[PDB]
Every structure is written in C-alpha cells, then in structure tokens.
Design an enzyme around this catalytic site. Structure first.
Site, short mmCIF file in Angstrom:
data_model
loop_
_atom_site.label_atom_id
_atom_site.label_comp_id
_atom_site.label_asym_id
_atom_site.label_seq_id
_atom_site.Cartn_x
_atom_site.Cartn_y
_atom_site.Cartn_z
N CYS A 233 0.93 24.04 39.33
CA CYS A 233 0.99 25.32 38.32
C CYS A 233 1.40 26.46 39.33
O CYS A 233 1.15 26.42 40.44
CB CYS A 233 -0.51 25.36 38.03
SG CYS A 233 -1.60 24.14 37.62
N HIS B 281 -5.88 30.60 35.10
CA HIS B 281 -6.69 29.70 35.15
C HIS B 281 -7.09 29.05 36.98
O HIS B 281 -7.81 28.28 37.00
CB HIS B 281 -6.45 28.42 34.34
CG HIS B 281 -5.30 27.63 34.95
ND1 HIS B 281 -3.67 27.82 34.69
CD2 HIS B 281 -5.47 26.57 36.11
CE1 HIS B 281 -3.11 26.97 35.30
NE2 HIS B 281 -3.98 26.27 36.04
N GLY C 293 -1.49 20.43 40.97
CA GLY C 293 -0.87 21.38 41.74
C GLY C 293 0.29 21.98 41.53
O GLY C 293 0.70 22.80 42.36
C1 LIG Z 1 -2.87 23.52 38.92
C2 LIG Z 1 -2.69 23.81 39.94
C3 LIG Z 1 -4.11 22.51 38.63
N1 LIG Z 1 -3.78 21.74 37.33
C4 LIG Z 1 -4.55 22.34 36.06
C5 LIG Z 1 -5.91 23.03 36.33
C6 LIG Z 1 -4.50 21.65 34.81
N2 LIG Z 1 -5.10 21.99 33.91
N3 LIG Z 1 -6.20 20.83 33.39
N4 LIG Z 1 -6.70 21.63 32.21
C7 LIG Z 1 -5.98 22.68 31.78
C8 LIG Z 1 -5.99 23.69 30.84
C9 LIG Z 1 -5.07 24.46 30.65
C10 LIG Z 1 -4.30 24.85 31.82
C11 LIG Z 1 -4.16 23.84 32.72
C12 LIG Z 1 -5.05 22.85 32.93
C13 LIG Z 1 -3.23 20.69 34.79
O1 LIG Z 1 -2.96 20.24 33.72
N5 LIG Z 1 -2.41 20.62 35.82
C14 LIG Z 1 -1.37 19.66 35.61
C15 LIG Z 1 -0.24 20.48 35.37
N6 LIG Z 1 0.85 19.64 35.14
C16 LIG Z 1 0.98 18.45 35.46
C17 LIG Z 1 -0.19 17.64 35.76
C18 LIG Z 1 -0.23 16.29 36.15
C19 LIG Z 1 -1.40 15.68 36.37
C20 LIG Z 1 -2.60 16.25 36.62
C21 LIG Z 1 -2.66 17.74 36.44
C22 LIG Z 1 -1.43 18.51 35.96
C23 LIG Z 1 -2.89 21.07 37.14
O2 LIG Z 1 -1.91 20.96 37.65
#
Ligand SMILES: *C(=C)Cn1c(C)c(-n2nnc3ccccc32)c(=O)n(-c2cncc3ccccc23)c1=O
Ligand SMILES: *C(=C)Cn1c(C)c(-n2nnc3ccccc32)c(=O)n(-c2cncc3ccccc23)c1=O
Lengths: 305, 305
Positions: A145, A41, A143
């Site tokens: 991921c 993603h 961030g």
């Molecule tokens: C990763 C670097 C950014 N990130 C994303 C893109 C997402 N996210 N939003 N919708 C999504 C659908 C499917 C997969 C990922 C996704 C996301 O959730 N997070 C994320 C992950 N863990 C904790 C967290 C806490 C607060 C905001 C975002 C977040 C990403 O980091």
C-alpha cells in the site's frame, strides 16, 4: 513492429517513493514538495482494520508518531491532516527530486502504469486499466500500500491511483491522490462486493486496430453493423455500450488503417458470436481490453518523454 | 495477490540513454563512465545497409563525425573503436548518473526488461524473454536501435541486450554489450532465417506454479510422469527438453506448493494433449513461457531494489 503491454518510464516516480511507519504498520508513501501522501490506514493496528474510527484513531496520534524514511534519511514531520482516505504528512524538507506533477481522477477504462513498492523501495512496474467496476487486476503483496499509479505527459507526471486494499475476491481497490475511493469501497476489512465487471469495448476495438497495423488481419470480415444492433451483441456478452464519443476517439485508427469503425464493430460482433476457433491475435487467444486508443497510437508512433 | 508481466524500475537506465548521430543516421546510445555504446550501423547510409564493409566505412569516419547528445548537452568524442558489432565512443566526461553495472551475456530462456528509446529519450518499458532461437518478440519502431535490455540485482544493473535490427519476419535481433550477436544474425539488410522457435518448458512449469499460488488449481490432475516420457510429449509440441537442472531450479516452487515437479509435468502433459477446453489460467488462454522460476519467486515474495 510488434505490440507489447508497455509501461511509462518509472524514473520520475522512483525518486518520490518513501517509507512511512506509524507504530508497527509500515507502508509506502509519495513524497512531493514538502508533503508526504500515504493511505490513512497506517495508523490502524491489525485488530483496528475491522471497524476503524479514523477520526478517533488519528486524534491519539501526534507528529512525532510518524516515521518517514527516504532511503536512510529521516524526514521531520511538522504537520498532519486527513483528507478523505489519505494521510498528508507535512515535512520540513521539500523533495529535491520532485518532478512536474498533477493530481488527476481518471475514468473507468483508462490505463495507467503502476510502480509496485515495498518498504519504500520500488520492486517492479506494469501497465493496468481501471475496470468499469472501479477495480484493478494488479500484482500486490503485503506491504504494497502506498504504491501509486501514474501517467506521463512529456514532462508532467499525472498521479491518478493509490493502492489501499486487496478485496477478498483477489482484486485490488484504492483511491485517487485526494483520498476519494474509486468505487463504493471503504478502507475497512469487511466483505465488499465489486459488482459485475464488463469489457471495455472501445479498448477492444483499439486493440483490433493495432492488430491490423502489425499485419494481423485474419479477423476482418465482409459485414457492417449499426451502432444500435452492435450494442445489443455487446450487452449480451457483458461489453460496454459503444457511444458516438467512442467512435470519435477511434478516428485516427480508422483513418490510418482505412477500416471504418462500424466495420470494425462487425468483425468484433462476429468474434463475440463465433469465438477465435483456436487462433490468436497479437499473440493472445482472447480479446484484450487494456489498451486505450491513445495507448495504441503511442506505441504505433513512438511517443517519448 | 495477482500475477502480472512485471519489469524492473527503469530509473537507473534512463540516466544513461543518450542520442548518437553520425551523418544522417540517428539512434540511441548507452552512456556508462566515459564510454558511449551504440550499434555500429549508425555509420551506414540507407543504401549502405545492403552489404556494408564496416572496417572500410569506419575508416572514413573521424572523432568529430559523431554527435553525442545527452538531453541538450553535447559530449566531446575523443576516441572511437569497433568491438564486434558495437561502436565504443570515448567521451571526455564521465556520466555522473552511472549506476553500478556489469555486462552479462544471458542464456536463451532467461528474461530481461527493455527500455524502448527514440532519439535518446525513453518511451516505455516492458518485460521480454530471449527465445530459444535467440530472437525476441518486442515492440520496436524506426529509431529504436540502441535500446538496451537489462536486469537489476538490488543495486547492480546487468546489461544483457542491445537492439539492432527487425528481421523481415517481424521479430527482433541484437547483440550483447560486447557486440556479439545473439544467434546467427549479422547487421546486414538481408533475408535471415531465425529458425524453429520452441517453448521454454521450465518457464511454463514455473508459470503453472504461480497459478497454484494464486488459487488457480483447476489444471492439477491425478497423474505422474517420467522425465523421459515427458520430454517425448514435449518434443512433439515444440517444447524444450526438460533436464535435471530444470527440475533443480523448480525446487522452491515445488516445496512452496507441495506439488512434485514430475506431477506438474503430468498436468502440463495433459494440457498439451487436451488443450484448455476454453478455460483460462491467470487470465490467459494459452501457455505463457516468459516467466523464469526466478521471476515467479520475485513476484510471489516481493523482492525490491
Ligand atoms: C499495507 C502496507 C498493508 N496491507 C493492509 C493493511 C491491507 N488491508 N487489510 N485489510 C484492509 C482493509 C482496508 C484497507 C487495507 C487493508 C491489505 O489488504 N494489504 C494488501 C494489499 N494488497 C495486496 C495484499 C496481498 C496480501 C496481503 C495484503 C495485501 C496490505 O498490504
Ligand atoms: C535504427 C536507429 C534504425 N533502424 C535500422 C537502420 C534498421 N535496419 N534496417 N536494416 C538493418 C540491417 C541491420 C541492422 C539494422 C537494420 C532497423 O531495422 N531498424 C528497426 C529496428 N527495429 C524495429 C524497426 C521497425 C520498423 C523500421 C525499422 C526498425 C531501425 O530502427
């Protein structure tokens, strides 16, 4: 001797964390040999996460559209492919800090250490467990991921988890290092049900064995129980059914403490029906289920790497 | 986003852990530049720990009586000295993996990460806190002396603790990296009283601020309190007296959540007098005091190194 939630030394994993940039999105990547692994993603915009056609979005991407950074050094991307839900960017340079590693798909209930990373830089390390509903209760911000979960066997680093999303309920979901999600989750910003989470019964029993080793013996009662009647109290309190395999793994803990497994299930049965009455076990006022029987043996014997 | 007990990446400390052998005793050492730091009781036998004359025992020791091993490589000892309770073995080779480091004597209530080691090999990492009675509740087995506690500031590793003994009560005691013990403890196998341990009040308030950030707001009440009347409930429940300095450190947490510090003390006062009634906060059924206000900010902002 004490008992603590302990994580593997993250030294071998720190040398593999890189930063991957595709357009505006930036997340963490895992650099092993001449291949960089990251969540797929990264090629999506903020508006693309609602309903992404990954096969169509990746088609519009070339090799030079991926910026891989290992510290201050840029990596040349000479190949890209999509295996399930992870992106594999082939680079022209093999990681000189590559440790002996394997890719492993762990089972629900097993534990692993997580190295939380942001912009390719490690921030912290903590121990977690794969809940029976294939979720994890970690500490992940925006961030995070690309952050990987791993186990260390002497010299080998067994990668088993890559973080991808935070569900609307606050829990976290991800895939293995081959891209297959743990559970019925998809990399799509939609409401997804995690399902009824239950307590890892074999991990609770191992945690009670660690309490007896450390001198905490107040919960030992004067009863026994059958494997059939115990799983009945377990199914009532949202606990995993105990099997003969679970009893076999608890063998060394039963022989070290001299307490039969069925007798430990009776003390656990009494704790489920009567509570703790305000007392604590190993400094906790609830039943901890994030220690596998192998984790208890490791910490009560001093296994190093 | 979740909240977990998080430890610093132990990569920079793994490259400094060596094994020190003097006679039959073997413990862990810390290799920085051309000096190896280890607990001075490595020169004592099992019968010497009862009443050791360290100045007399070290006199009978020469440079070649110390075997320092970094993996499979032997280090040549060309100098030895005793600073307080640590032994400083000068070696002919500077550690090529020496990071930017400082020696820091932390204050009671502050936290640090511990890298548990055995025979010079790291085994695990976990976060702990220096209790007000200058003890720690860690996970230490036989051979875990030499294990260091540290904090990481971007590029600098602040060493602050070296493990030496396990008290008869089960807790652990040690020194700083200059040999000065934390508390009234001595490196002698005798019964030593740790004293009345109390709860780090400023750490509990910071942990409640982390709960509100993560959505756990059920404990917020409709009261306020004075700094004098709060320390009265605190002194009754074995809590540290709250000072204006503690309120100043909780500033950013009070501005991020919009909850005044005195209002947070009122919710804490109600929790001390009424308990939790069976509820949980951040997955814990008790008041956690091992998160400093700086630890809460780091985990709720994603500070990397
Ligand atoms: C990763 C670097 C950014 N990130 C994303 C893109 C997402 N996210 N939003 N919708 C999504 C659908 C499917 C997969 C990922 C996704 C996301 O959730 N997070 C994320 C992950 N863990 C904790 C967290 C806490 C607060 C905001 C975002 C977040 C990403 O980091
Ligand atoms: C360290 C490598 C060996 N070790 C020692 C020598 C001691 N120990 N026994 N009496 C002592 C007096 C003063 C200082 C140390 C000391 C010791 O306590 N431990 C130790 C430390 N932490 C946990 C632990 C658990 C079980 C046995 C020993 C032990 C040592 O490891």
């Amino acid at each position: 001797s004490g008992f603590r939630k302990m994580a593997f030394p993250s030294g071998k994993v720190e040398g593999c964390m890189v930063q991957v940039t595709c357009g505006t999105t930036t997340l963490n990547g895992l650099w092993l040999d001449d291949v960089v692994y990251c969540p797929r993603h990264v090629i999506c915009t903020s508006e693309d996460m609602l309903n992404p056609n990954y096969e169509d979005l990746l088609i519009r991407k070339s090799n030079h559209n991926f910026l891989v950074q290992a510290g201050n050094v840029q990596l040349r991307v000479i190949g890209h492919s999509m295996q399930n839900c992870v992106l594999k960017l082939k680079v022209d340079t093999a990681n000189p800090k590559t440790p002996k590693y394997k890719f492993v798909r762990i089972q629900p209930g097993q534990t692993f250490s997580v190295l939380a990373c942001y912009n390719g830089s490690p921030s912290g390390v903590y121990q977690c467990a794969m809940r029976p509903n294939f979720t994890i209760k970690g500490s992940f911000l925006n961030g995070s991921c690309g952050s990987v979960g791993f186990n260390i066997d002497y010299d080998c680093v067994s990668f088993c988890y890559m973080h991808h999303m935070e569900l609307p309920t606050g829990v976290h979901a991800g895939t293995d290092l081959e891209g297959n999600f743990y559970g019925p989750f998809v990399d799509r910003q939609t409401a997804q049900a995690a399902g009824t989470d239950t307590t890892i019964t074999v991990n609770v029993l191992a945690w009670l064995y660690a309490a007896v080793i450390n001198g905490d013996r107040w919960f030992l009662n004067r009863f026994t129980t059958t494997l059939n009647d115990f799983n009945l109290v377990a199914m009532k309190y949202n606990y995993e059914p105990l099997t003969q395999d679970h009893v076999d793994i608890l063998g060394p803990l039963s022989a070290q403490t001299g307490i039969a497994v069925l007798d430990m299930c009776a003390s656990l049965k009494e704790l489920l029906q009567n509570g703790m009455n305000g007392r604590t076990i190993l400094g906790s006022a609830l039943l901890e289920d994030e220690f596998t029987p192998f984790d208890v043996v490791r910490q009560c014997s001093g296994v190093t790497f």
